[PDB]
Design a protein around this ligand. Structure first.
Ligand SMILES: CC(C)(c1cc(Cl)c(O)c(Cl)c1)c1cc(Cl)c(O)c(Cl)c1
Ligand SMILES: CC(C)(c1cc(Cl)c(O)c(Cl)c1)c1cc(Cl)c(O)c(Cl)c1
Lengths: 9, 240, 234, 10
């Protein structure tokens, strides 16, 4: 999920 | 945890430092706007603001201490409240108008459907901020409280409850920070407690506006006339 | 034009609020509800009776009767479900894992599934009850919080009210000081309690949505009063 | 016409 991705990047 | 070790002044400086930028819309005064496109401007803006918010959250003392799972939850729960409080803050000096962007200042008239009700609440909240003479230092504290508080009672075993205790300790730190600010402003002790209550009670109305807005976003999505980004659809989805 | 509420002392306010408390009502002794129909039949009947008591409770909250009739209507229309919910969560405090809708209707989350969309609300209520319990919420604090909801929830969708709200804040601090909390414990606890009001608002909003869906699913008729309280939330 | 309007006055 996008939010998940952005929180990690 | 560096978070629990920060002083009032350090917390204030940290939160002020992490403030995201104010972005511009694609609004063009010469260009005609329907109900759709006007909403297309707002959803486009919100989408971009969300990326900045996500990165802002990482800089809020204590937030990164949490599991990715918990970070996702808090943001899914708080995202609209956070956008809304920022909007209300930016609009404080523009009575009767909402400053979505430096180049997009709307009034209730340009409420076109069901958005007018939400506009009215946001305006009322801005008016309240104005009535109280809300300060920037108080604002950043409130915004961080929203991130940490809104989803903390809707999160396993006995462990993963220590996750919650940490959040409550950070929250307490932010309360201490608020009191410190008011004391420095020469407020009497009675005035300090009264103002703290007045500020925290606003969070109840922000929650209300967020839930009403989430309903409105769902209906716009179902009417399929207003374009919604993929990120926005996922955050909306998290509220079912 | 001056309200008696502002002239009261912290103890007079607390005693007034304690004295205004409505009674704990019982559910019909029939139906152990395991159907959607019987479940919502019992809960709506109970809510109906609780509302009448809540309205007469509100009239006894210092400063409330000083408002115009229209303002009183607005405040109650906005806060009614929040007020029912905070009462439920309070009554359920000494019953971990259980929701005490009435002394003879104590339900759990299993109960909730027998009504599409209800287990989610039950879980939020239970979580709040547990939070209250761990905070060791006192009854004197509870009545202050309930009155804050009545006066606060609808106040921005409109001075006197804010003065009364301040008085209640003074009253809460007065109670915590009386209980021997340090200054820092006083402001921290005040914050913790008021932050829970955000969650109560959230539960009310979600509950109002659920109540609306149940109205459209039409598995049980609602009273005219309950329908009008629901309709006020457009 | 609200029931609430009446109950508040009763
Ligand atoms: C597009 C969105 C999410 C929004 C909110 C904020 Cl607070 C914001 O700053 C930006 Cl730029 C976009 C929004 C706007 C309105 Cl008026 C509305 O009624 C609903 Cl339901 C959602
Ligand atoms: C019936 C009602 C309004 C209710 C709420 C409270 Cl707090 C109460 O105490 C009582 Cl005797 C009745 C209710 C409850 C739930 Cl759990 C619900 O999902 C929906 Cl749609 C409505």
């Amino acid at each position: 999920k996008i939010l998940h991705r952005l929180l990690q990047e | 945890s560096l978070a629990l070790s920060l002083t009032a002044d350090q917390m204030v400086s940290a939160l002020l430092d992490a403030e995201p930028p104010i972005l511009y819309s694609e609004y063009d005064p010469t260009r005609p706007f329907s109900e759709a496109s006007m909403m297309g401007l707002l959803t486009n803006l919100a989408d971009r603001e969300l990326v900045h918010m996500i990165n802002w959250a990482k800089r809020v003392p204590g937030f990164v201490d949490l599991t990715l799972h918990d970070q996702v939850h808090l943001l899914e729960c708080a995202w609209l409240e956070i956008l809304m409080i920022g909007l209300v803050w930016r609009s404080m000096e523009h009575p009767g108008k909402l400053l979505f962007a430096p180049n997009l200042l709307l009034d209730r008239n340009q409420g076109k459907e069901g958005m007018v009700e939400i506009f009215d609440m946001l305006l009322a909240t801005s008016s309240r901020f104005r009535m109280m003479n809300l300060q920037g230092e108080e604002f950043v504290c409130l915004k961080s409280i929203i991130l940490l508080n809104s989803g903390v009672y809707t999160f396993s075993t006995l462990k993963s409850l220590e996750e919650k205790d940490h959040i409550h300790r950070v929250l307490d730190k932010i309360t201490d920070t608020l009191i410190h600010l008011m004391a420095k402003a020469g407020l009497t002790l009675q005035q300090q407690h009264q103002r703290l209550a007045q500020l925290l009670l606003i969070l109840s109305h922000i929650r209300h506006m967020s839930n009403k807005g989430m309903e409105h976003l769902y209906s716009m999505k179902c009417k399929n006339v207003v374009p919604l980004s993929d990120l926005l659809l996922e955050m909306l989805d998290a509220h079912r």
